[PDB]
């Protein structure tokens, strides 16, 4: 019975493809069982006769088993690198549950064999996992069955780098077991030369890095992006042992602590211009940052910070003097001591929102163009805003806080035009005659205990949106009639209202109105149902 | 709580895509449950903002439910013919068992 197989094989062994066709048809008629038909389909696939595979799949309708074995026709097709036969067989697999197990098995087989095209088609077209194990039944998930490891250990560097560029990751075993080719790939295929290189080792899940990998080129730059991985520690050279770095991305990792310094003498990276250490597990920043006078951006948000810096209230700090951006939001800071904060001179953007802050930091003469401190427990704001930021601050977000009254200073500002002052307990404003926010475009004064609200007449040409929903409003303040230029208004969530003023019709620019759960006595039900227009 | 949705929708209703981004990030921080995140992903997909769908799938890592419902972000993406958004969402589906049921729907 098995002879039929050999006979067909004989026809292919001598190159007699037509005789192989005849013997194959005879066996298919005599091969009723699924295993025998699968073997018949394996014969030409192993040989490489794509045409006869097509005939068997199309006319004989031969089933393609999903067993991840070397007897499988697709496995042998991948074994010999016959990409056309592999795709032809894989197309015949029925049902939605694509048999990934077979795909990983043949993927690792191709990686071991060196058939790059088969690996490419499997991973890119059929979605075979480049980071799972090609493990069969009664087999263990050993790294030898992992396709990147099998590719690089086999000497198939091209397949390994292709896998890395198309979803594979490095791990401790790769670096420890094959450090030479691993460092070769790290030192070649992630380098953007510019000397002052730009090396992107991020998104590689590297559990550790070594000076041995690139410190030889620390003359100007070794690397810049080490984010998006599982790093838990660093050499101190990575912070400050490199000469002409300009940007470092040390974010999105397990770096709960960064190496520190004893003085500025230990810092060689005096040229750093931005640093990204967010999305880490930091409780405080190292004081070495307080020696980088040239650093222009620091972003240490998405951390567990309790303080910006340790209480070094004696040292002549010069660093961060020219810092423009400090983003330390999404942290657990209750106090922002005036020491380090007043050491700044060039800050313009301060993002300290989403913290446990209760007192806004004691202000100082520094040109803040924008400040976000919402999602805090802030009780009040300083009165020196108009002293320092009268001509600088444009965006303010002190909303969602425990604040009860905004002093006149915020509204005495001139450059201020973007106000988010909701989510507070404020119930009364400073008199409108004291307001100098001529450039005001958006005023979000919702979600508070405000009732009368007054506006400068100048805002007749300035405001584009005004939010006053969800307040203690029983009657619309008549001052709204001033705001001809207003385009969007909220008045909903005010159950005490019954009259909609006629003067709102004078506000020509209106296109939308929050009429949510507002019953208007002086408007018929039909007009209310039709909408704001 | 539902207001967040409408607020983001408002930003897209007037064409304010950056304001929609800000409101979307705020809601994502305040939307922990899978259904709320799926709704947040449905908003731009129904609108057609492929960029914000990409940001949600890549950065926020928003889960894509396999329920064959008109609330599904991919279903609404197919509803308005936004082919790019449909492929972007369908690429995010994990695992080997490709949810054919959603695909037929």
From Swiss-Prot, chain A:
Modification after translation: Autophosphorylated. Autophosphorylation is inhibited in its dimeric state.
| Signal peptide as annotated in the record | none
Q: Which spans of this chain does UniProt mark as ANK repeats? A: 1-31, 36-66, 69-98, 102-132, 143-172
Q: Report which superkingdom the organism of origin falls in.
A: Eukaryota
- Which regions are annotated as LRR repeats? 220-241, 244-265, 271-292, 294-315, 322-343, 346-367, 368-388, 392-413, 415-436, 462-483, 485-507, 509-530
Q: Where in the cell is it found?
A: Cytoplasm; Cell membrane
Return the similarity comment: Belongs to the protein kinase superfamily. TKL Ser/Thr protein kinase family. ROCO subfamily.
Record text on subunit structure and interactions: Homodimer. The homodimer is autoinhibited and stabilized by its N-terminal residues and ANK repeats. Interacts with CSK.
Q: What is the annotated role of this protein in its UniProt record?
A: Serine/threonine-protein kinase which phosphorylates RAB proteins involved in intracellular trafficking. Phosphorylates RAB7A; this activity is dependent on protein kinase C (PKC) activation. Plays a role in the negative regulation of bone mass, acting through the maturation of osteoclasts.
In the UniProt entry, the disease listed is: Osteosclerotic metaphyseal dysplasia: An autosomal recessive skeletal dysplasia characterized by osteosclerosis at multiple skeletal sites, predominantly at the metaphyses of the long bones and vertebral bodies.
Q: What is the name listed in the Swiss-Prot or TrEMBL entry for this protein?
A: Leucine-rich repeat serine/threonine-protein kinase 1
User: Could you tell me which species this protein originates from?
Assistant: Homo sapiens
Q: Which residues of the full protein are shown?
A: 51 to 620 of 2015
Swiss-Prot record, chain B:
Recorded superkingdom: Eukaryota
Q: How is it modified after translation?
A: Autophosphorylated. Autophosphorylation is inhibited in its dimeric state.
ANK repeat start and end residues: 1-31, 36-66, 69-98
**Where is this chain's protein located in or outside the cell?**
Cytoplasm; Cell membrane
**How does this polypeptide assemble, per the annotation?**
Homodimer. The homodimer is autoinhibited and stabilized by its N-terminal residues and ANK repeats. Interacts with CSK.
The function of this protein is: Serine/threonine-protein kinase which phosphorylates RAB proteins involved in intracellular trafficking. Phosphorylates RAB7A; this activity is dependent on protein kinase C (PKC) activation. Plays a role in the negative regulation of bone mass, acting through the maturation of osteoclasts.
Belongs to which family? Belongs to the protein kinase superfamily. TKL Ser/Thr protein kinase family. ROCO subfamily.
| Disease named in the record | Osteosclerotic metaphyseal dysplasia: An autosomal recessive skeletal dysplasia characterized by osteosclerosis at multiple skeletal sites, predominantly at the metaphyses of the long bones and vertebral bodies.
Q: What is this protein called?
A: Leucine-rich repeat serine/threonine-protein kinase 1
State the organism's lineage.
Answer: Eukaryota, Metazoa, Chordata, Craniata, Vertebrata
Q: Parent protein range shown? A: 51 to 155 of 2015
């Amino acid at each position: 019975r098995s002879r039929r197989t050999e006979g067909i094989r004989a026809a292919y062994r001598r190159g007699d493809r037509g005789g192989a066709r005849d013997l194959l048809e005879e066996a298919c008629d005599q091969c009723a069982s699924q295993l025998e038909k699968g073997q018949l389909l394996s014969i030409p696939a192993a040989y490489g006769d794509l045409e006869m595979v097509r005939y068997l799949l199309s006319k004989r309708l031969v089933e393609l088993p999903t067993e991840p074995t070397d007897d499988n026709p697709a496995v042998v097709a991948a074994y010999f690198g016959h990409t056309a036969v592999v795709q032809e067989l894989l197309e015949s697999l029925p049902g939605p549950c694509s048999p990934q197990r077979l795909l990983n098995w043949m993927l690792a087989l191709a990686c071991q064999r060196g058939h790059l095209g088969v690996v490419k088609l499997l991973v890119l077209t059929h979605g075979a996992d480049p980071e799972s194990y090609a493990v069969r039944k009664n087999e263990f998930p050993v790294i030898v069955r992992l396709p990147l490891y099998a590719a690089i250990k086999s000497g198939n560097e091209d397949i390994a780098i292709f896998l890395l560029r198309h979803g594979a990751y490095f791990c401790s075993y790769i670096l420890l077991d094959s450090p030479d080719p691993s460092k070769h790939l790290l030192r070649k295929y992630f380098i953007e030369a510019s000397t002052a290189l730009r090396v992107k080792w991020s998104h590689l899940r590297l559990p550790w890095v070594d000076l041995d990998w690139l410190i030889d080129i620390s003359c100007q730059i070794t690397e810049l992006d080490l984010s998006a991985n599982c790093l838990a520690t660093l050499p101190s050279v990575i912070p400050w042992g490199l000469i002409n770095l300009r940007k470092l991305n040390l974010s999105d990792n397990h770096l709960g602590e960064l190496p520190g310094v004893q003085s500025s003498d230990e810092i060689i990276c005096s040229r750093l211009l931005e640093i990204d250490i967010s999305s880490n597990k930091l409780s405080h920043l190292p004081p070495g940052f307080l020696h980088l006078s040239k650093l222009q951006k620091l972003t240490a948000s998405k951390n567990c910070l309790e303080k910006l810096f340790e209480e070094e209230n004696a040292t002549n700090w010069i660093g961060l003097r020219k810092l423009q951006e400090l983003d330390i939001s999404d942290n657990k800071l209750t106090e922002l001591p005036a020491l380090f904060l007043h050491s700044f001179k060039s800050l313009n953007s301060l993002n300290v929102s989403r913290n446990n802050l209760k007192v806004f930091p004691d202000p100082w003469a520094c040109p803040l163009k924008c400040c976000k401190a919402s999602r805090n427990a802030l009780e009040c704001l300083p009165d020196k805003m108009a002293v320092f930021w009268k001509n600088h601050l444009k965006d303010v977000d002190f909303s969602e806080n425990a604040l009860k009254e905004v002093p006149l200073g915020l509204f005495q500002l001139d450059a201020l035009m973007f106000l988010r002052l909701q989510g507070n307990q404020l119930a009364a404003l400073p008199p409108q005659e004291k307001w100098t926010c001529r450039q005001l475009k958006t005023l979000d004064l919702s979600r508070n205990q405000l009732g009368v609200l007054e506006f400068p007449a100048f805002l007749s040409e300035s405001l584009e949106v005004l939010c006053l929903n969800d307040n203690h409003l029983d009657t619309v303040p008549p001052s709204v009639c001033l705001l001809k230029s207003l385009s969007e208004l909220y008045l909903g969530n005010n159950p005490g209202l019954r009259e909609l003023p006629p003067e709102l019709g004078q506000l020509g620019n209106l296109w939308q109105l929050d009429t949510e759960d507002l019953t208007i006595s002086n408007v018929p039900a039909e007009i209310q149902k039709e909408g704001p227009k």
